[PDB]
From a paper:
The SARS-CoV-2 translates its genome into polyproteins that must be cleaved to release individual proteins essential for replication of the virus. As in previous apo and inhibitor-bound crystal structures, Mpro crystallized as a homodimer.
Six additional cocrystal structures of Mpro bound to the product (cleaved N-terminal side of the substrate peptide) were also determined and comparatively analyzed. Our cocrystal structures captured the N-terminal product after the cleavage reaction was complete where no covalent bond exists with the catalytic cysteine. The N-terminal products carboxyl terminus is coordinated by the catalytic dyad. All 6 cleaved substrates bound at the N-terminal side of the active site superimposed very well, defining a “product envelope”. There were no major rearrangements or shifts in the backbone and except minor side chain conformers, the products bound similarly to the noncleaved substrates.
Numbering used by the authors:
A (entry chain B), D (entry chain B): -6 to -1
B (entry chain A), C (entry chain A): 1 to 302
């Protein structure tokens, strides 16, 4: 999956 | 006695945390003097997160698009700019709680305390290490971006980390306080992977010394080794090479315990090859590498 | 995501910590309104520590024997009294930083944050559990007495622990804030031993749920068990009995993960009988029991 | 050994 900007 | 993952007191940093809202996106900012620092993706929309052009997104914003709230007091943005991957929001009120602070970039292997925040409100404090692959194994959910990592020496807070994102493996990536990412990561919701990690050897030895100081001695032996023969075993179990400078840093601990660094290395070699055989060290069945030599001295007294 | 031993932000408590000196003995006190709370053995001499008569030692003291320093400002003692194992030193200045607070006594199995202090100055924050044998596994050196344990809910600090002493095994004992010791310990430098400890089962299950929420699933199975058959296995591995009330407390976590509590018990039974077989859960090779169901929900979001 | 008042 992709990174998550938090 | 006793040895615990121990964070620095967080009060000085708590008074710096604020909430930054742009549109429907909210995160935390760091309020020092008359400037608020926050991750730049606050200006992002849910759709503009695969490959944002932050320079375009920011030219389409103005001071009144940024809503900054210190507690329930609204701070008025009188200026805005981008510094690498963070924003500097000038406000008209200098933070009265501004501590003596430094912006430092830390090295893989060093530790810091993290004040996890949400909507500008602190939720918890814990201790982190910067991994050799420039990720950190933290505890962060949506809205935690803007939380900072820090150390405290004398009265000075040395800010070393601002949180931005979570990688697919569950580890976390962020920037220093000048906005430059730690490691080869970018603030885009793309497929990114950290390089293969390694175990911080000097920290493991330091933790073994903390164990000796606290009465755990079953892993000691009468043997010794050379730095060369030890490093051969390290390479095999995915441990970082040990340098003469690591041996010097471990001097004080080696002196307090009377255990020579290279004699302690013979113990580590033995634990790597045979395991613990069902025993524990400081309440762990694994070799712990998130304590620096400095952390041990800080906690364990003479 | 991620799961860490996480302490509450300590700022509200930092502003309450002061140094109390009597003769050559120094420790920390808790300054709330116009009263400083500290362990009573501050009035002890090095020789008067095998079996002190605190009631005698205190009648031989007066207000001017107690030196209280908030930072570098000296606070003037205008009254003194003993409440069980702690002292209440009336001072003429109410602490302006006094937070909304409660004095609560906690139960074995519950956790709290500890602000370790020395000479009235905070040094670190970490998370502790009250063990079934009423000890805590902390990190405390000489001069740490007077440090407090606490939880924070809404704006209220619920003080639950004041540190007094270290037992020969390295574990720590203390009082609630009314001065009553946790467990069968006394503030004398005598040979004392805590009863045999047990592992907090409900906390282990809660930690397993935190693991599922964070992607660790290898320990799950298709099996289930009854509360009765599970408790038989618990008794064997020195685990506390599991009650129907523990199953209810675990409801929310059971609901979020879709794993029924008694199905999770089948996983725990299996980990107790066969071990982990070299794998890890949330970075531990041991079953962790210092996280309450509440702690998990606090950290792990839906 | 004995307890240690800290």
């Amino acid at each position: 999956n992709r990174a998550t900007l938090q | 006695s006793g040895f615990r993952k121990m964070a620095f007191p967080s009060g000085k940093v708590e008074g710096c945390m604020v909430q930054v809202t742009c549109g429907t996106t909210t995160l935390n900012g760091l309020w020092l003097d008359d400037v608020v620092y926050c991750p730049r993706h606050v200006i992002c929309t849910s759709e503009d997160m695969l490959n944002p052009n932050y320079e375009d997104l920011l030219i389409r914003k103005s001071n009144h698009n940024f809503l900054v709230q210190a507690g329930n007091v609204q701070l008025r943005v009188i200026g805005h700019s981008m510094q690498n991957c963070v924003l500097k929001l000038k406000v008209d009120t200098a933070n009265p709680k501004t501590p003596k602070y430094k912006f430092v970039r830390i090295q893989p292997g060093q530790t810091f305390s993290v004040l996890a925040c949400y909507n500008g409100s602190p939720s918890g404090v814990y201790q982190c290490a910067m991994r050799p692959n420039f990720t950190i194994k933290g505890s962060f959910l949506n809205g935690s971006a803007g939380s900072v990592g820090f150390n405290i020496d004398y009265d000075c807070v040395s800010f070393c980390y601002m949180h931005h994102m979570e990688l697919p493996t569950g580890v976390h990536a962020g920037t220093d306080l000048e906005g430059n990412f730690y490691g080869p990561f970018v603030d885009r919701q793309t497929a990114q992977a950290a390089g293969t990690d390694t175990t911080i050897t000097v920290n493991v030895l330091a933790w073994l010394y903390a164990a000796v100081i606290n009465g755990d001695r079953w892993f000691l032996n009468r043997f010794t080794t050379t730095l060369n023969d030890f490093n051969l075993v390290a390479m095999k179990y995915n441990y970082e090479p040990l340098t003469q400078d690591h041996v010097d840093i471990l001097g004080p601990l080696s002196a307090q315990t009377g255990i020579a660094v290279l004699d302690m290395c013979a113990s580590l070699k033995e634990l790597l090859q045979n395991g613990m055989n069902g025993r524990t060290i400081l309440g762990s069945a694994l070799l712990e590498d998130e304590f620096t030599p400095f952390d041990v001295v800080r906690q364990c007294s003479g």
